[PDB]
Amino acid sequence: PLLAAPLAVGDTIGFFSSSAPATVTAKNRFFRGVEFLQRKGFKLVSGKLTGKTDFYRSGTIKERAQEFNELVYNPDITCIMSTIGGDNSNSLLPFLDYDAIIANPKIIIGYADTTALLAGIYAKTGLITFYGPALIPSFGEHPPLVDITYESFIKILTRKQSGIYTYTLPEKWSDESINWNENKILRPKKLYKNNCAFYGSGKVEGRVIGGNLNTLTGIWGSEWMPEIRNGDILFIEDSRKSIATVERLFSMLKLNRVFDKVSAIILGKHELFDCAGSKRRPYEVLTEVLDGKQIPVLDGFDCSHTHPMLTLPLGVKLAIDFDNKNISITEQYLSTEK
Template sequence: MEIVKPPKLSSGDTVGIVSPASPIAAFCPNRLQRGVECLKNLGFQVTLGTYTSKQTGHTAGTIEDRLSDLHAMYRNPDVKVIVPTIGGYNSHQLLEQLNFDLIAQNPKILLGYSDITALQLGIFARTGMVTYMGPALLPQFGEFGGVFPYTWDSLQNVLMNPQPNGQPMRQSEQWTEENLQWDREDTRARVMQVSTGWKILKHGTAYGRIIAGNLSTLLLLAGTPYWPDMNGAILCVEDDETTDVAMVDRYLTQLRQMGVYHQVSALVVGRFLSATGFSAEDSLETVLTIATRGYAFPIIYDIDFGHTDPMMVLANGVMASLEADHSIALKYVESTVSK
């Protein structure tokens, strides 16, 4: 399959906002507006989908509503990047009726994370279009005081630079998982923690295409035409606060039993929230060691992506290398966008 990279993002470009999954934008208009203003302050124009703030039960509009907004953004020649308001649940409902020909004919950056994994990896699997795990409107661009500098720096490096800089991805010095209720409590900066750094579980080197996403959402694609090619992949996974230790174990074991560990060249695990419940007696290291027993590929964890902030941007389908020895060097070895 030919890999297609969307054109780079430039200052002054138009960002299209959609809600392909949950209807959270309907309940926090102030946070929505703050995210829009952040993007404008960063130098972009913004257009909102017709159904961005709609609620139909547990989703942001019907399947047809959400498809209409997404297709409209791909048809709009002014829109260069599509940013979801948030993830949530049920974006995979759109895959059966998604116009993959339209998407292939109009290469654009699709950003987002969490439940948006279903769209990003489904599109990559069906079209070869590179997609980008990264910030969404409400949680990151709607942050009090604006998007975190680390997140913005990573976005610029990955989406606005058509030349690979050959530099390893930088580790954040601080991070936060503090949860302030949107439109009620988010009127101050969140409390930050000092990062203890990225960690190595299994040493080694790897070279392969980045495949990144939310672990539980990725597994929704198993056995469907939307499952991405894992051969040689540097698989990057994370999950949210609704996922406990037993569920993480369950998901990692499913990957094992699907034969994914026979295929990948490395496993990169994002930082989990404390609500997941890992402890000294029931640790992530133990769960990973048991799930990947018998495999020698490198494994690193506590990496800056997932449901903590700030976050890096990971480009699905782009070649990268990993060196996990005395220190960790994860870097792209080719351009992440086209000119």
């Protein structure tokens, strides 16, 4: 794969708004996230749509593509980070400068709707991009959880690329929809013990592919959807969905023969899943849809809309040890030097 140069303390991070204009609509949280990264020593470059609104989005399709391309063209930038998702980054895909991305590989990171860009860029260029923090939701989170998110971000992106990397499991997590865009918390979030489950045995190693599953529907079938291959590990997460929607999306995968190919599935923790009173969890729905197909599942990986969030390279090999209950990156995902 095509690899970006690694991150280092003091580097420049550029940020872009490919969908929702949250630098305006969540401006307090945005400022807290900016301050958070600056205090860590990063220099920030604001994308040209910062502070702008076009109702539900930051700008026209072309304006948003331009905003992103301009960061790619900036030789001082090591990391290009989403401000926040939304619904609309898939629109940009015909207009991104893929040749410039190939010529100037950078760390591209975000999650949620930004999946369309992460997956589409990988499909077009082979660049290893990252499912991980977006500036506003992730780094504007109040302590204590933001510190755990940051620890994963800095570890994954700065560590020496030698030997496998085994993830640490956050001790506590939350998905509550509070403390969003004000100076002070209303009250502390509920902190849940980590209930991640490893359904299976032995060790499975394969290329990880995926992201936000609902968002993948916006690129599905196109040249921007990376082909899923035999032996891949499917990584999928969703946020604030009804069980009805989750069944629909899992069945979409089934119809597409995805479950005939993949050797394991990672379900990110689902933020505020709505079980419609059934008390069922997504894994149970997946099990019905699988119709007897035995695939080991890591249910509840902390790389999703829940806090804290780990950083995950997409398109490289991972190894899930279902017996020892751990997950590791086993393939180089950044260049050894800048």
